[PDB]
């Protein structure tokens, strides 16, 4: 519907005032049907819209909602290096060892994308560096050659 479509666009743009205007109990966890079924929190998280992320969480956004590929907003935060966002989600109860349809964890995302401090954050909250995805790869397996500091951290 149009209202949900606009909410999603606002959460993506970081347009707080429009979020405040369209976020109802009915719509706060709506899903983008045309894409990979992201929720407003997925978008706010993936696009590093901290205020929107805070607002949505405070107004009942589901920190554990999986999209079409089985991603939770923490995946989005971790893959794109949004540290504060990652911290917000974790502090609000996000499961760190959560796994998508391919058994990728946020730690797989953060490791493959070369985000050290995010990897560290995940490890401090008990992320398992030994978890394998569908390809039989640990997050360590996914680390670029240059990122020896991340290899060391995961090891």
């Amino acid at each position: 519907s149009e209202a949900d479509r606009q909410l999603l666009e606002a959460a993506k743009a970081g347009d707080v005032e429009t979020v405040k205007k369209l976020c109802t109990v009915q719509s706060v966890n709506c899903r983008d049907i045309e894409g990979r079924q992201s929720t407003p929190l997925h978008f706010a998280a993936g696009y590093n819209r901290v205020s929107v992320v805070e607002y949505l969480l405070q107004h009942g956004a589901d920190v554990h909602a999986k999209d079409k590929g089985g991603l939770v907003p923490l995946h989005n935060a971790c893959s794109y290096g949004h540290y504060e966002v990652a911290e917000l989600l974790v502090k609000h109860g996000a499961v760190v060892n959560v796994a998508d349809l391919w058994k990728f964890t946020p730690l797989h995302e953060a490791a493959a994308k070369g985000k050290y401090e995010i990897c560290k954050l995940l490890l401090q909250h008990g992320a398992d560096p030994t978890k394998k995805n569908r390809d039989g790869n640990t997050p360590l397996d996914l680390v670029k050659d240059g990122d020896t500091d991340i290899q060391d951290l995961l090891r």
Binding site: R36, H42, F43, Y47, N48, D67, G69, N76, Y80, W102
Partner: peptide, 12 residues
């Protein structure tokens, strides 16, 4: 096949 999360690394 597996595609990227909604989002991007850089706000600019």
């Amino acid at each position: 096949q597996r595609t990227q999360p909604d989002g991007q690394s850089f706000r600019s």
